[PDB]
Paper text:
In budding yeast, the centromere [name] complex guides the deposition of CENP-A, an H3 variant, to form the centromeric nucleosome in a DNA sequence-dependent manner. [name] is a four-protein complex consisting of subunits Ndc10, Skp1, Ctf3, and two copies of [name].
To stabilize the nucleosome, we engineered a hybrid DNA, CEN3-601, by using the CDEIII and its neighboring regions to substitute the corresponding region in the 601 DNA. The CDEIIIR DNA region associated with H2B in the free CEN3 CENP-ACse4 nucleosome was detached, and the full CDEIIIR DNA was in the naked form. The CDEIIIR site that interacts with the L1 loop and the α1 helix of core histone H2B in the free nucleosome is ~15 bp away from the GCC motif site. This structural feature suggests that the [name] domain binding to the CCG motif could have an allosteric inhibitory effect on the binding of the DNA by H2B. Alignment of the structures of the CBF3core–nucleosomeCEN3-601 and ([name])2–DNA complex on the [name] domain reveals steric clashes of Ndc10 with the nucleosome core, which explains the dissociation of Ndc10 from the CBF3core bound to the nucleosomeCEN3-601 and Ndc10 binds to CBF3core weakly.
Numbering used by the authors:
A (entry chain D), H (entry chain H): 37 to 128
B (entry chain C): 19 to 115
C (entry chain M): 6 to 48
D (entry chain E), G (entry chain A): 45 to 135
E (entry chain F), F (entry chain B): 24 to 103
I (entry chain G): 17 to 116
The structure:
DNA sequence: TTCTTACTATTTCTTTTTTAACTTTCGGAAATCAAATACACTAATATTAAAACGCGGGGGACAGCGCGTACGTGCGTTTAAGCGGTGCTAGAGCTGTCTACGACCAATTGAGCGGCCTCGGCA
DNA sequence: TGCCGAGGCCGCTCAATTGGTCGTAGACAGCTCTAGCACCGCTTAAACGCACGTACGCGCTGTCCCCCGCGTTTTAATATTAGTGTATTTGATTTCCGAAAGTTAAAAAAGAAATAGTAAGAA
């Protein structure tokens, strides 16, 4: 079977541009890109986790890894979006 | 959990998925949520920058040339996505005199 | 060699590490324990 | 030099596969045949090579162009291609 | 006539047009054939290794993407 | 007088001697100060991140080597 | 040009730290101070930077040298350094 | 404590040049280099193992990984040395 | 009998198999893989060491310094091609003069 | 006044203490054998876009020549590195213990997926 | 403009979740102490301006070479259809290492057993 992100992606695209259409090949492009960034951040987090002799992956380590894989203000505007959802989730 | 944090991307799928990689001994609680938030923000960013070119070329279906206009513009994103290749992507329009 | 059972001896049914398919089996021919394998399927 | 600049942007818009696919396919099958197995391919894998091939070739073209423009000429000689590949790592 | 000359001088000139040049030599075509052949050996050696290890007697696109990942180059659109 | 001018023109000339040149401009020193400063920001940002994450208030050499590993550069001799 | 070639190989043998360490240390402490923490260092980490720093600087020196030799002059201008860094990836 | 390779390395160096001496800093250099190659090959083997849906790391996978990390005849003269010791070990 | 003597090697396979369990590379470690890897590591260590010994022999020096390792690793290709991005601490550059 | 004499490290004999190695258990991985199934590749044409491929011709590459700014280049100093302590107090290690927290084992699903279709919105 | 697309449709099956255990973290607490940084205060080697000329980057002119014209063939092209014979993937089945149990030892320090110096006290 196919583990696409297509429903999620197509429901994301209606948030901003609710009229624009998408291509299946383009869908594959950004799906592969999403998997790439996910693998990059998770691999980086794993290396620093095994560095500091820790056995678990908390959101502290993810906060470090997003701050190093993402550059500059893209990181600084991903940290705030990252730390927002966890506190909304916790107070629920 | 996706409704419990307001996310459009599946938290539980990610939380199952990184466990299937032996990335460490244990997986913490808020970390898949943190990944889901980061991926959602990045998807929102790239869809903004894609939909700009999509409107500006008077098109509805996003074609990958309109995507490579988006990737090759944001210098932080293009710096992050330096070593990438996209099929039928095109080239950056830039020449000398 | 008589590659004819390719099947575990009774010692292998107790201790399934591999099966040699020997006389009486090389699984049985380590600890000098013919007696269990001549008290077995026994061809 | 009647046509040099109104056509250099003409194919910058028409994003397609530019290297013609059949001699590319025969070349890759021959150099695969130089390795041991008589090894067939998925049909998609040919294009999967071909886009990466054209990407590398365009990248080296642009790099040696900018090198030759620094070299205060407008023509590319293989002397500049050797420079552009040598400064970029591989050789 | 082997297939390395199947890469025609109009095709190299055409990619050169997309490259961003107008004047080129005639030595360019033979030089770029050598460079491109070196690139293809250095990638399909890895691809054939990935095909041979998995005991599969045909090459697919995921093998290609996995091979290109070793070069420091990533190709989306086909899975990877 | 900040420390970016602490990199003396004799030091740049001396490294240029080990570099393999004999004629250089006077614009070279200011240009290479800019390039070197850009390199140092792009490495010590990662090193300070690695120091900050482990809740340690000092930087050691393993942090340096781990930071340089991100650049695509490996340094032996100090552990890594 | 009395001394240009008998000394260019003199320091190719004497492998040492060439950048003087104290202003290097003050520079790195100042640009660390531009980041938030008042963050001290291991003493070895200064040299651990310094060898990598000199390695990068020698690499760019040699690259822009070979570029300028292709540029049919023997002098380096910053125009060539900008070329050498621009063709090499980063900017 | 320190997990050096110093005794092993110093006993290796007597095999060929039994009179030459070594430096402690030089000892650290090639020890770090050995750890680097070990991490490279093991990480590469892990990625291809998780690729082919396998849960264990046999010497087949190591044979692939040494054949890709090491280049050319250095790989071809490491494969033979690698496959020699395993058969000597097995017939013991 | 120890496993290294049982195989005829010098680097510790008992350490190598122990590190791979603690390395989280995959779920299980096939027996035979760590000794196979230990053989390659034992090969490469002496392989570079012989070139370093030859570098110390042409300068009549009874003590290996990092310049010897730098010169050895930069002289021949396929090792310099393997280590194409490393910089040894206090290593220096090859003797090179160009046609000026 | 060196013949002695028990200190005195010392240096080698012997043992404890710090791990690695040889058996069981067996579960879940992995190989095997057979069948179903997909498919990659030959082969017929049919264009037909596309490569050679010419004989102009012009425009760029390239070489020679003044030249003068603008580089090395000792020379004479001043200025800090840097070596050598002091030194004292900050963080790094480094254990004692334990509240909390994820692994996990079951139930309990609904939601995110194949697969048609009905409808005609984008090139 | 039309023709083939692209969402919008229903059935459904398997992962998401919910709720408890509980084994063991890493998390604070209270150390011991380097060790790093601050500081003085020496040298003395190196940076820094100065006249100092030659080069050499550079601009100009001439040359002439070769690279792109576009008509005109000429040769190989995508692009179809069908066969089709291989490889490939499931799937029970069966065999079987992998881990994990640790209890023979062992590693090198530790203390002692000579032991070869070893400072002093009379011919
Ligand atoms: Zn048996
Ligand atoms: Zn038996």
């Amino acid at each position: 079977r196919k583990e696409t992100y297509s429903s999620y992606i197509y429901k994301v695209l209606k948030q901003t541009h609710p009229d624009t259409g998408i291509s299946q090949k383009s869908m594959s492009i950004l799906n592969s890109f999403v998997n790439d960034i996910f693998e990059r951040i998770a691999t980086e987090a794993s290396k620093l986790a095994a560095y500091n002799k820790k056995s678990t992956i908390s959101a502290r380590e993810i906060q470090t890894a997003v701050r190093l894989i993402l550059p500059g203000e893209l990181a600084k505007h991903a940290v705030s979006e990252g730390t927002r959802a966890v506190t909304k989730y916790s107070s629920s | 959990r996706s409704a419990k944090a307001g996310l459009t991307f599946p938290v539980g799928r990610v939380h199952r998925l990184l466990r299937r990689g032996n990335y460490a001994q244990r997986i913490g609680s808020g970390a898949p949520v943190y990944l889901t938030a980061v991926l959602e923000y990045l998807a929102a960013e790239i869809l903004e920058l894609a939909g700009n070119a999509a409107r500006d070329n008077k098109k509805t279906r996003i074609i990958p040339r309109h995507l490579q206009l988006a990737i090759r513009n944001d210098d932080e994103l293009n710096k992050l996505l330096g070593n990438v290749t996209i099929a039928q992507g095109g080239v950056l329009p830039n020449i000398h005199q | 060699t008589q590659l004819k059972s390719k099947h575990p001896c009774s010692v292998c049914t107790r201790r399934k590490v591999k099966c040699d398919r020997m006389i009486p089996c090389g699984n049985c021919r380590k600890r000098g324990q013919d007696s269990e394998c001549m008290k077995s399927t026994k061809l | 030099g009647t046509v040099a600049l109104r056509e250099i942007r003409r194919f910058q818009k028409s994003t397609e596969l530019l290297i013609r696919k059949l001699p590319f396919q025969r070349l890759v099958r021959e150099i695969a045949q130089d390795f041991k197995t008589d090894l067939r391919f998925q049909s998609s894998a040919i294009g999967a090579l071909q886009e990466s091939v054209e990407a590398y070739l365009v990248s080296l073209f642009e790099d040696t162009n900018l090198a030759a423009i620094h070299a205060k000429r407008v023509t590319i000689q293989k002397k500049d291609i050797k420079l552009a590949r040598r400064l970029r790592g591989e050789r | 006539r082997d297939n390395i000359q199947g890469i025609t001088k109009p095709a190299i000139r055409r990619l050169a047009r997309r490259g961003g040049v107008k004047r080129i030599s005639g030595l360019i075509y033979e030089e770029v054939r050598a460079v491109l052949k070196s690139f293809l050996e250095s990638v399909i050696r890895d691809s054939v290794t990935y095909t041979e290890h998995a005991k599969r007697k045909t090459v697919t696109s995921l093998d290609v993407v996995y091979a290109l990942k070793r070069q420091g180059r990533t190709l989306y659109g086909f899975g990877g």
